[PDB]
Amino acid sequence: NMSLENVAFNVVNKGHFDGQQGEVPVSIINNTVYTKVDGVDVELFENKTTLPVNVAFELWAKRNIKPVPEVKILNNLGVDIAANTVIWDYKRDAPAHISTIGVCSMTDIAKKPTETICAPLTVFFDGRVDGQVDLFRNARNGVLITEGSVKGLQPSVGPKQASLNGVTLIGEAVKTQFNYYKKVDGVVQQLPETYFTQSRNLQEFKPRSQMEIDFLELAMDEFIERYKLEGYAFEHIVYGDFSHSQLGGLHLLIGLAKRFKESPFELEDFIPMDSTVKNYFITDAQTGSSKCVCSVIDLLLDDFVEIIKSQDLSVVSKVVKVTIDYTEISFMLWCKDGHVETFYPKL
Amino acid sequence: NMSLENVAFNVVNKGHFDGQQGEVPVSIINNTVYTKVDGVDVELFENKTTLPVNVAFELWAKRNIKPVPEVKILNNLGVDIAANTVIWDYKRDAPAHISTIGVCSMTDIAKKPTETICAPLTVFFDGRVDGQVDLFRNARNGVLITEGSVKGLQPSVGPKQASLNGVTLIGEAVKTQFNYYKKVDGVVQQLPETYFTQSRNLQEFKPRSQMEIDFLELAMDEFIERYKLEGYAFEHIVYGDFSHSQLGGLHLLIGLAKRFKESPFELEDFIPMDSTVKNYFITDAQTGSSKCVCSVIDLLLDDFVEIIKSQDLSVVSKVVKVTIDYTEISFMLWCKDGHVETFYPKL
Amino acid sequence: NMSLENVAFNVVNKGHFDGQQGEVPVSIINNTVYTKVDGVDVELFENKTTLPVNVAFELWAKRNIKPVPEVKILNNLGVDIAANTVIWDYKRDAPAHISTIGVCSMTDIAKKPTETICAPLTVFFDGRVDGQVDLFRNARNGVLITEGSVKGLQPSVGPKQASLNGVTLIGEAVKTQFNYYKKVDGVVQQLPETYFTQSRNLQEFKPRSQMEIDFLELAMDEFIERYKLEGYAFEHIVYGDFSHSQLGGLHLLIGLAKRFKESPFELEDFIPMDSTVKNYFITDAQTGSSKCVCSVIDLLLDDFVEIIKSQDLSVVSKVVKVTIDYTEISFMLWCKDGHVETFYPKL
Amino acid sequence: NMSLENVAFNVVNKGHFDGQQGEVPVSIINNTVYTKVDGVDVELFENKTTLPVNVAFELWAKRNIKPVPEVKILNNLGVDIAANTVIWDYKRDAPAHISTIGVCSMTDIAKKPTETICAPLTVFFDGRVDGQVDLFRNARNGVLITEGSVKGLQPSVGPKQASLNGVTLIGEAVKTQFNYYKKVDGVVQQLPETYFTQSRNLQEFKPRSQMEIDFLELAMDEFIERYKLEGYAFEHIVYGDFSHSQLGGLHLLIGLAKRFKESPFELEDFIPMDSTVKNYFITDAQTGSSKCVCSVIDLLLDDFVEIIKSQDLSVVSKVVKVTIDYTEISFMLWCKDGHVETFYPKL
Amino acid sequence: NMSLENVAFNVVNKGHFDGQQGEVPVSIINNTVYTKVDGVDVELFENKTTLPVNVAFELWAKRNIKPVPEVKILNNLGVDIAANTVIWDYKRDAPAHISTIGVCSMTDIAKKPTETICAPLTVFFDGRVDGQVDLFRNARNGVLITEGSVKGLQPSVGPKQASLNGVTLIGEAVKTQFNYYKKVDGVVQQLPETYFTQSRNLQEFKPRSQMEIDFLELAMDEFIERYKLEGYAFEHIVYGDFSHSQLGGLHLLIGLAKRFKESPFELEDFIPMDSTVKNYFITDAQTGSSKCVCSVIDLLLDDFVEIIKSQDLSVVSKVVKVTIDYTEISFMLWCKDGHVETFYPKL
């Protein structure tokens, strides 16, 4: 089933593709879809993807509008494709996956995940949709989310937050914390113990523990004393050092949030996509201190403190692996004389 | 009279087309107009319309820069075309009307509104321009605005606000409240009694009555008690219900403004144009409550209260017609046992 | 169920729009329409019009595939729009008319030509389609073609040739010669007595009378003697003068055909459209003689001879008007001492 | 050191990608690749594909420049992708296959065809390249061409002709006739006995047997008598019937070649791709006879005669299947009273 | 009053820019310039340059329409820019030079060539325009053409042919042979003695001496005997060797012309520009012999014979430099035992 004009009718009348019958007049010009409303053209969609404009329009209209896992989580779990839905990537304004199953005649590689062409792909299955748990049970490769127990399968508890129409949130009127399951070549995997990033943003950062409240409210020296952090280089790593040409440290989102509340700065997101670790070209407006590649992660401060306090500090430099968002993140740890000098993630 | 380079000279030197002689060097690339300033190119206009870039540039330069009726009002009155001006639609970044009269050689269907080709079109006439009241008196079909009395014609008092270079405002240094007149097939119409929407926006919403002040400052239960609104379902319709998966009610702009001051949310304007009723795909960031098509109108709260208190509540569901911005808006009214359950506009 | 994908299905399976049910997947990119065949994209349509790509595609697919008048004839008769068909202009690769009636939801101004919007427009009606003669009688402005008499209407016999899928031809298996009728402001208009151009082209030129045969085969001065053309300046007007830097004469297509056979030249068609008189920037490859604006008409040589011999040769210069293809073509006639100096379509 | 500028260096200096070191400056604009030569831009490549301009440029530069199977043959054998080369499709001006193996970092799905991702795809292998026979034996799905025997493998002799830089030819200084082999699901598949189309074109048509010579030179009824073809409806099927508005028959390329020599006609190639049977919208310029979907195949006339004379003429209508270019082509055969009425590729 | 609309008026009414007053309505879309004629858009110009569409349109309209040197000559003489004219390059569909002097406000670097910015550039001056000889004498770097002597300046007689509106020709009604002069760093430079290429093309090739007539008409071994060319490898160099997979020799255009008459082949012009020596990827359709880089020059056969017979045949290999079109062309000469093996433009 295909029809540009019917996709546009659904967008106009239902806000997204909803399977309704109808058609509206459509114009395509300069990667933009328009529809005619009382004699004039109104823009419905501007294509920012590398797909043809009318195809991208249809996949966007058919996006999943329930809370879904953030794209960084699906990527870290190796998801290739989704069963009978589109995960829209709002960080890239594009489909999270290249191909589809049972969504769109231009992009489908299959109608159902049970077709042979899907067996080697890691298919994303959504236990909230009837039949999909059983499709996972029969799939060779897959990732399954559920809201509850699955008989015979041990769950991994996922992050508290999920994405709902591009808004990352911890649901109160809707469930956003899923159980996760994964199969590789027919065999159910044990997913690793993992930390999770918190997916917050600078502008409306909110503390999620008493330590984070204290970090935002106390002066640096008072906080470090109260939590006994002498010798872990929080002054550099978390608070940031703005005294030299190259900006020192500043690798934890909460420290950017604290600075940003007193003093604005520029973050150039030069690889704009969803990932567990983000790299920014940062320029501090007050001092002129700057750094071309400043890796930034949003861990709960208590989690970051546990990680850094769980390392051996006896060697000048080494790689530290930390499971975060189900993937192995490498950190560089630099020490001198038994104390930390710096500790920072790599992307 | 036509000249791309002369249009650009006026934009550069006068801020808009002002009839001055002169030329500057112009480049056209990728729907953008540039001019050369001391050896480098500077962007003057990016075309967002479905017209050719150089044509859209000229119509934008020739836009009316006095306060003019909002486009939703002209549309509701059936205006097809403007006499010797361009009403620029800043919600669509495009001309409000497809064709012109005496503006642009590529888009003109006539030089003067008296030409035969204009007789069946509803032409917009502006009494602030010499001769246009008399052109209206002789036109078969038209809408006329004035700042004052017209001899022999009974006026309809329009909204307080108008649009000045895309800023909607109630003029204090300039007049924005017009008298309105309309002719159909040579016959002066009696325009209907109408409410008017208030054209406010979320970010800088300002109350315009003591009831609206009270609504913003009081708690829900205190407000409802003080204005005796028990049984009219304001809890649902106006304040919004964020307790379930689907966001309940929230159909009045002032209730979105109250929520927005305490708690942010996402409004997807998926049909971006000026209209009396707007539809948004809304996602509440705090709760995750959401709704694909949430119709929203900005009526003065006192007006909305008068409307809902003027309905018969004895039937499960029915259509209620309300004249707003000169057009008949349909509302669905749902009642149970003599009280309101919900009441919401349709677009 | 009209749609882009259904238009494409018809083009792929029927060669044009044929009202058949079905859909194929379509990609829109680079002002081009593709469809997927065995997993790869195949081009169906490259938009050369000023319409949106998907709209132009639909009008092209819905083009009239029966013999229709050449566009130059419809233009000369003042046709603005066609009733329930598309006349495709193969000289411009675009619709002959900007709007439609009952064809396409993006370009329609009406569904039927009886709607009031169509009254000021000259609508083209095709008596080969049921009901269109009656619609012509009810239309305020229009042009009608038929294959036979219409009771009470005075006919004009049209050209022998018509256009079929872009091929101009004199039909043997189909009828290409029509009666023409026209109405202005509600009143049937007498069409003038007229010559018709022959619509031949340079490389496929075939003579159509004994005189044209003799012209192609005889030497210049033999032809002029045999047809008693001394003093009518055929050496200049028809054969052309290549002796000076500016090319002299050469205004009849058959004269270009004679030269071309012997010696090639370049014709720059700098306003590419169908027209009774064409203007070319001509450069002769053998001599270097050239002319920026060389007007060329393809009359039967017998007709041109009749035209020029009917002229009063006693004045130095005068404008001579000849009805050709239903339009008045102005010629300049320059004489001296009772003989022709030159005679050319006036520019 | 693969790069855009190095691809362009190779095109400029070697005519195609040849693995040479070096770079030239490149400009990308308007879906076109330019390079700077003596201070001005010179066009190297105009992208007509649905791939990004710089990607399509690289695949075109890396096209196989030896004789390769025509695309219609590879399509009919189910080829999905090629091992370490690009088969350029000169009928579509685009790669024959969407993905690559070991060619281009933007389109590669693998570096070697032994990778697991390639197992479900039918990979084209070229025995003229070292190692590719062994890769075919290890591939689950594939098509192999060679110039000689492969031990133990049962060959199919392919067409005489192949494509060299877009020129279809029967090689004299190079070998163009290959053995073909195919594997499905790990098992070598017997290729069917098959006719081959001749890949000739209308204007350069040359006969290839005594019968085709006689067909081009004799009058219709002489040819039919000499080759005893009475009752096989060659008048309709091969010579074509131009007497009615719908063009009758004309399904063999040699019959079009005979007509074209005498009288020109228009062939609209409305699905432009390489195919065993082609469909055209044909308009005869002399008569006006036309047909929207005229299927045309270029068989050696001797083969077509053998095919139609082998048919049972005792049923009113039946579907006749003939293997041509390794694919099953369905023909409709219509008979009456023991003679052929018509016989055409089924649509 | 220069403007886009005035340039378009001149193109429509005069065939090119002619300084006339007037305007027409213009639409810019898809790198194309349209104008409105009887209510529909007609294409005037498709931009194939790397300049903005409206700028390229103006330079094309302002092209020199008198005979001018071929671009290959101006390039070989080092011309950077022209004084107060545009040399249009019809091989690239683009201006021959990037900047202008006194032509176009977007591309001008100066209004007059006497301005200081022009001193380092080699400016082309045209003695047929009043004042330009004097400007050449005042210019630091320049190239001058005239139709006659300039007092005290030592002339170089140029090629017989010139380009007129893109047609290369030897003028009979106009003069195409010029005197050439050149200045470097303020000093008049002696131009070298030189051959000239003939600028013929493959399909319109006409011989220009008795030897070229004999070459086209005689069999290979007769020609070689009659002109005493044994031991000079004309079999290879001129006639070409099609017996091996790599095509041998074939470096003279007349030899391609002889082959083409008998048997067609494909020439891929993979660097499309005007050049004294052209390189083609050639594929012979009859044999399959091909060559990726086949250098081709169009010398009069008599000149090439004189060149190769003047060579010392006693060394195995050597670089031979010949001045052609004022530039030094390197040839490789390979000999063995006192006879030529091959002789070709060095790559």
Swiss-Prot record, chains A, B, C, D, E:
Uracil binds at K291, C292, V293, C294, S295, T342, F343, Y344, P345, K346. The active site is at H236, H251, K291. The record marks S295 as: Uracil recognition site. It comes from the Viruses. Its cofactor is Mn(2+). It catalyses: uridylyl-uridylyl-ribonucleotide-RNA = a 3'-end uridylyl-2',3'-cyclophospho-uridine-RNA + a 5'-end dephospho-ribonucleoside-RNA. Residues 64-189 form the AV-Nsp11N/CoV-Nsp15M domain. The record marks K291 as: Transition state stabilizer. Residues 3-63 form the Nsp15 N-terminal oligomerization domain. Residues 206-345 form the NendoU domain. Coiled coil: none annotated. It is found in: Host cytoplasm, Host perinuclear region. Likely affects Nsp15 binding to RNA. Plays a role in viral transcription/replication and prevents the simultaneous activation of host cell dsRNA sensors, such as MDA5/IFIH1, OAS, and PKR. Acts by degrading the 5'-polyuridines generated during replication of the poly(A) region of viral genomic and subgenomic RNAs. Catalyzes a two-step reaction in which a 2'3'-cyclic phosphate (2'3'-cP) is first generated by 2'-O transesterification, which is then hydrolyzed to a 3'-phosphate (3'-P). If not degraded, poly(U) RNA would hybridize with poly(A) RNA tails and activate host dsRNA sensors. Homohexamer. This is Uridylate-specific endoribonuclease nsp15.
